[PDB]
Amino acid sequence: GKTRGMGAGRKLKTHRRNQRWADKAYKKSHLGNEWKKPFAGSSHAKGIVLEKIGIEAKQPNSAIRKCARVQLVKNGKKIAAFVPNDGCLNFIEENDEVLIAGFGRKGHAVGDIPGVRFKVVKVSGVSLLALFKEKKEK
Amino acid sequence: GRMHSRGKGISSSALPYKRTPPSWVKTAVADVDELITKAAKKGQMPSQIGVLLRDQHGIPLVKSVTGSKILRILKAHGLAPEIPEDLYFLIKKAVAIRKHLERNRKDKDSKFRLILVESRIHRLARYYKRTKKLPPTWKYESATASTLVA
Amino acid sequence: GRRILNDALRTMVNAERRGKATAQLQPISGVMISFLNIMKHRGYIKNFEVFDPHRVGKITVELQGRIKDCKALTYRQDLRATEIEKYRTRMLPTRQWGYVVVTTPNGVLDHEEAIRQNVGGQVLGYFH
RNA sequence: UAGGAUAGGGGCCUACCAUGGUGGUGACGGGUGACGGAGAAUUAGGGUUCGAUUCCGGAGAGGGAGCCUGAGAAACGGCUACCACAUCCAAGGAAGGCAGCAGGCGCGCAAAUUACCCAAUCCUGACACGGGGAGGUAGUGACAAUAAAUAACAAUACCGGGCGCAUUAGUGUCUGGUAAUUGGAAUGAGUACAAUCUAAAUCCCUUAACGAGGAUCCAUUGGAGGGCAAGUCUGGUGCCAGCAGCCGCGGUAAUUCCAGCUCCAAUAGCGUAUAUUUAAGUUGUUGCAGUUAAAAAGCUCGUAGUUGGACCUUGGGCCGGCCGGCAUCGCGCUCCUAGCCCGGCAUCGUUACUUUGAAGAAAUUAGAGUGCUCAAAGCAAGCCAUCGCUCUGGAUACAUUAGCAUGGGAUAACAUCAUAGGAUUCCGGUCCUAUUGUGUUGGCCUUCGGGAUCGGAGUAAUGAUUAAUAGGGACAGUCGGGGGCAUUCGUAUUUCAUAGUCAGAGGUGAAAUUCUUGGAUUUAUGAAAGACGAACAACUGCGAAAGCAUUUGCCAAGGAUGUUUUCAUUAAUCAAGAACGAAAGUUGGGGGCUCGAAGACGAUCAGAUACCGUCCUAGUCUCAACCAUAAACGAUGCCGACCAGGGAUCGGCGGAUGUUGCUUAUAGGACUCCGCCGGCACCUUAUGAGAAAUCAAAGUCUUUGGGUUCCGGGGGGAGUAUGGUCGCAAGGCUGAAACUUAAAGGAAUUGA
RNA sequence: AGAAGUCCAUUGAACCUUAUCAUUUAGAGGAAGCAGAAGUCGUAACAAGGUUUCCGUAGGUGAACCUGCGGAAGGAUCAUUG
RNA sequence: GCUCUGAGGACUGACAGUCGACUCAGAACUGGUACGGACAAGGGGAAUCCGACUGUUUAAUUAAAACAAAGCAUUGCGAUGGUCCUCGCGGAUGCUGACGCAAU
RNA sequence: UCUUAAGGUAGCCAAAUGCCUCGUCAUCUAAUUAGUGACGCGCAUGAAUGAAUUAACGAGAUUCCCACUGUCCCUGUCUA
Ligand SMILES: [Mg+2]
Ligand SMILES: [Mg+2]
Ligand SMILES: [Mg+2]
Ligand SMILES: [Mg+2]
Ligand SMILES: [Mg+2]
Ligand SMILES: [Mg+2]
Ligand SMILES: [Mg+2]
Ligand SMILES: [Mg+2]
Ligand SMILES: [Mg+2]
Ligand SMILES: [Mg+2]
Ligand SMILES: [Mg+2]
Ligand SMILES: [Mg+2]
Ligand SMILES: [Mg+2]
Ligand SMILES: [Mg+2]
Ligand SMILES: [Mg+2]
Ligand SMILES: [Mg+2]
Ligand SMILES: [Mg+2]
Ligand SMILES: [Mg+2]
Ligand SMILES: [Mg+2]
Ligand SMILES: [Mg+2]
Ligand SMILES: [Mg+2]
Ligand SMILES: [Mg+2]
Ligand SMILES: [Mg+2]
Ligand SMILES: [Mg+2]
Ligand SMILES: [Mg+2]
Ligand SMILES: [Mg+2]
Ligand SMILES: [Mg+2]
Ligand SMILES: [Mg+2]
Ligand SMILES: [Mg+2]
Ligand SMILES: [Mg+2]
Ligand SMILES: [Mg+2]
Ligand SMILES: [Mg+2]
Ligand SMILES: [Mg+2]
Ligand SMILES: [Mg+2]
Ligand SMILES: [Mg+2]
Ligand SMILES: [Mg+2]
Ligand SMILES: [Mg+2]
Ligand SMILES: [Mg+2]
Ligand SMILES: [Mg+2]
Ligand SMILES: [Mg+2]
Ligand SMILES: [Mg+2]
Ligand SMILES: [Mg+2]
Ligand SMILES: [Mg+2]
Ligand SMILES: [Mg+2]
Ligand SMILES: [Mg+2]
Ligand SMILES: [Mg+2]
Ligand SMILES: [Mg+2]
């Protein structure tokens, strides 16, 4: 069982330090690889799109989720990012200036889109919800 | 449980309630003390002394008849063994085992038992070093240990 | 090894939970009998024998079925008389009954006694 | 040690000498997207994460280095030099340092005015006057926080439920609303005379006149399948577009997409992303789990570490209404606190724990008072005839750990009266300093006072707890397929020999490869070789585990039992370290029967690199030396206690009369009965436990705490890469990440 | 008194060469893991999965896998007094 | 180069006297930064092929990767024998005997 | 499917073994028929004809880098 001697404070503290590492959340949060991800501990990241691509959807579904290959101005990563509205992809055009944010699930692929972790939230300095809602055209 | 086996025996000697000696024990403490020293200088350890009295001379417990333990009479008369009872006998058993093993090199069981016996020797010897019943330098050298005993 | 005042209380819980009339205890202690004095003072067990012929000792208590649980907190705590207040809630069933027995420089005594004499100490255990 | 230097201690530095200092209680090293703290967010408790930032401390002024002045600087809104950067040059030269305020570029997801002012708070100077991008005021400011509008009230109405009878009606009460219906009231958003505010303006607070018909003085954000509150609405799309945190929706009747109506939750706010807290008893000290779901090391030894059996007077009283003081069978006190001979006095074991006290920076937090109109706040302000002043407050708490101080001695560690070198009033021997008889300074001396030393007499209860259903050791009769060395035996298998016989034998479901009239198979006798030790042989023993079954001898060892023997806590578990550890496998001898990986064949089959049959190498066996793993299993660590019943059985012991194909008779051996321990197990039952299967130990668990070691945190990637280390090699031990995934998995039920 | 200069110490930037640490990054070729699809070859596993399964070790084979030696039941047997 | 300082010993009667050839460190000064001043006396590194190394070899053109080597394996042989010499008688291995001789 | 007694196994390579050949790719260089490292349907690699590696050693063969230099640009002079 546990060690419960009145003098075992050293053993218990060392043991918790040692055993918190098996916890996935602690390991992910302190291992330092979050600074080796594309955003590197950032919420959003402005990037330049290379091309509107479009990608397959997973087994139970069947569709073409319209994403884009974007380059990060900050550290040069090239990644894939979704465009979250109906027919919204048209607003995006090659080599435009977009803001890329996490797509949910905290850096983990979401839903039926295969291996994509990112969403477009701005383009050419105009709100993309506003583009969808004709509030302001770029 | 036995400290070097998973045996769990509880066989032992259960001491009688009355600390005072029984009626029929009427030999005097001085004569019992002379019996102690006679057999001690004849060369027997406290275990043999107690057994001898309990068998031939009808002395139930020497503490009961005298108020002082065998070793204490022997320590007061300066006949006490230089190396304690149980450390002596653990050393003698280690000498026997090692002498057998030096000729029987394939005896892995005897090698294990020797590991255990020397472990017991060293645990007990640390106790005797802490209670100052052994010299503060007495170290169990496996080489020249057979001179010490037997 | 033995660390009694647990070997006594767990025997008492087992005897009570089985409904036995008397339970006997193989080692004793001044601390053990001072704990049983707290139980008997607060009216949870009735009178008892302390067999002290010659050895560690032996005890026989008669259970009245009025006890419900009794334990030892080996890993005996430090305990101020300002902060029993969150041991009584942490261990005892409620704020009306149940007693936490803490050894203090005035001998073994329960936590309500410790409030009024305003002396703290080490947890020996509890019963409720 | 001596010095030099510093304002000063100091290896700060020098000369000489010594060989030391730190470390598994983590040094040194590395990371830190790390200034420290007061503190911030969240919080049942405990915690987890953060803290660049206006308060304190430190450090820097592009990077280093060096100095002047000065009380104060290694200053950068001071200098010198180098390096990086850059400005002016009339081409020799010269000036540099916004991480000060504002502002410009760049970097970025990310951050405002090149404003006014010395009036307040204070600083500064030679100083009541100057100065102050400290600091305040104003502009941008949905960072965060506070109060809080977007209507209210009336009768009319198709109406809509009782209530006045309640039938049979009909209209009735709060008005519920679709009413742009009708109606006069209320006001601030806004505009604005003015005043007030202000250093001057501005805002706020007041307030001339203006300022509401419901289209406006228009509220949005997101959502309407489940979670999760709100459409089995309507149109469009048709596995597309798309939605969807997850489960899922969409394949022509979409409650899930795109639209409209309706509605819902929040509401001047809400959605989104990341990080973090809660959820999370999914990090568990409180408070998890390890038989089977992830997890007991193969097993034992073992140092540190952690944990440690029982035993020592406050035992009974008075006394006054939780405690003072008392006495009893209280080692003494000379001195301060020291009674109207006497309470409650020094030095002559440590700690922890615990009580109380002090000191504890404010701000923050808790918390007292206080009508800023409330509230966030703030520290004010309230009452006189609210007429030449009264009463004022500006509390208090917390502050873990370390340090200081007082009371206790229960609990827990350390050290230790048995060699008495012990305690004890005294007696004088060694030698000593000097005060009052040295009125002055005094300096050695006789009883004196005192260290130190010192011998002998003296007294006292003269001084050592028990001996654990803890352990070690001894001893007695045993027991065991426990271990090592040697040694006897057994049939069988093969080979071979001698003799006999004649067509087959071997193998299979059936075959063939194979052997065979050079006589196979079979039978008998015998010899060699090496292996194996049947039956007996078991819910049986021994062993730390692996493992150990022919005989006798020898050698050491061992558990249990028995014990009126001894030691007296010596113990339990154990990072580091160490011993043994099946089979395979490796190096090299010996042996080479059987069997047999690889390999070669014959069958089968579609294939047959397999199952099947023949031959067979290594190997199987032994020795010397390695290896270190097994579903190494009880998938159940080790020591301890309690709890439920029974019969078996293994070993030891104790007690029974009652028969032995024994015994010169008995005892003893076998057997029957009863009881103890210690084993290996089993059968029944929950009153227990568990997800159950099941378990008398996996129980004594949310009524959660005996001690201790190892070890798990969804599934993969993977016991993989890399690094280390051991090994001849095979490999062993130690051992990630990226990425991917929504299940994988355990137990039981029904069906197939 | 007193400057340039100069001497010797001391602090010592800064550059240079090597060594080395750490963080990223290139690499022909080799070889892992994953995801996808409406592929090819088999039938290894789950029933006695058609040769019971599996663990350790060794050798082999296109692939699953096969076999040898030892072990386990998580077995298809809790069972010989019949 | 020169001037020094320090440490390391012997014999005789923790000290004193007598003697001592050397080695090892440290310092100050000095020179046209020259100093192992003549002589003597390794160039270093990254790799590939071959042979393990040491050794031997075509005297008078080839010094090597060739030959040998230990290590590994194989074969014959138990004396009336194996390999071999000899014209014959006889002889070598053998002053030997399988942990040996002999042939690869 | 024919055929063999068996069909080149473990490895290894334009290797001192590869004709085509100056093989293809990468590296080295300004430039490489050379060197190394890989690729292998290999005229004609391969297991005691021993195969693959292999630290140390080599008056062994080959390639490159640093120092060095009258080898060279490019010759000059001195001495016996
Ligand atoms: Mg988690
Ligand atoms: Mg799915
Ligand atoms: Mg026991
Ligand atoms: Mg142990
Ligand atoms: Mg000094
Ligand atoms: Mg930092
Ligand atoms: Mg500051
Ligand atoms: Mg500064
Ligand atoms: Mg400076
Ligand atoms: Mg400045
Ligand atoms: Mg600025
Ligand atoms: Mg909406
Ligand atoms: Mg929607
Ligand atoms: Mg909708
Ligand atoms: Mg609902
Ligand atoms: Mg969403
Ligand atoms: Mg939805
Ligand atoms: Mg869990
Ligand atoms: Mg498991
Ligand atoms: Mg085990
Ligand atoms: Mg220990
Ligand atoms: Mg025959
Ligand atoms: Mg048996
Ligand atoms: Mg037999
Ligand atoms: Mg394992
Ligand atoms: Mg296991
Ligand atoms: Mg019996
Ligand atoms: Mg996991
Ligand atoms: Mg299952
Ligand atoms: Mg199958
Ligand atoms: Mg099968
Ligand atoms: Mg099966
Ligand atoms: Mg095979
Ligand atoms: Mg085969
Ligand atoms: Mg099963
Ligand atoms: Mg050579
Ligand atoms: Mg020649
Ligand atoms: Mg030559
Ligand atoms: Mg001959
Ligand atoms: Mg090949
Ligand atoms: Mg080739
Ligand atoms: Mg070249
Ligand atoms: Mg090549
Ligand atoms: Mg060939
Ligand atoms: Mg060939
Ligand atoms: Mg061959
Ligand atoms: Mg050849």
Distance B146 CA to D589 C1' (A): 38
Looking at beta carbons, which residues of chain B come within 8 Å of C53?
A: 17
Residue of B nearest to C55 (CA): B17
Which tokens go with B6? 């998973």
3-state helix, strand, coil in chain C (%, to 5): 30, 25, 45
Subunits that touch chain A (at least 3 Cβ pairs < 8 angstroms)?
Answer: C
Distance B9 CA to ligand 8 centre (A): 80
The H or E element containing residue C113 is helix C111-117
Spatial CB neighbours of A112, under 8 Å, sequence gap ≥ 6: A57, A58, A60, A61, A63, A65
Which tokens go with B42? 């004849």
Solved using? cryo-EM
3-state secondary structure of B28: coil
What distance in Å separates the CA atoms of residue A94 and residue A73, rounded to the nearest whole number? 15
Nucleotide of closest approach to A62 (CA, C1') = D239
Rg (CA), chain B: 19
Asked whether C4 and C29 are in contact (CB, 8 A), the reply is yes
DSSP strand E in chain C: where? 22-25, 48-51, 58-62, 70-72, 99-104, 107-110, 122-127
3-state helix, strand, coil in chain B (%, to 5): 55, 0, 45
Distances (CA, A) of C118 to A32, C80, C82, C86, C111: 52, 9, 9, 16, 10
Q: How many CB atoms lie within 10 A of CB C109?
A: 22
Query: Of residues 7 to 46 in chain A, which lie within 7 A of strand D by their beta carbon?
Result: 7-8, 10-12, 14-16, 19-20, 22-24, 27-29, 31-37, 40-46
What distance in Å separates the CA atoms of residue C13 and residue C19, rounded to the nearest whole number? 10
User: Resolution of the deposited coordinates, in angstroms?
Assistant: 3.4
Query: Of residues 66 to 105 in chain B, which lie within 7 A of strand D by their beta carbon?
Result: 68-72, 75-76, 84-86, 89-90, 93, 96-97, 100, 104-105
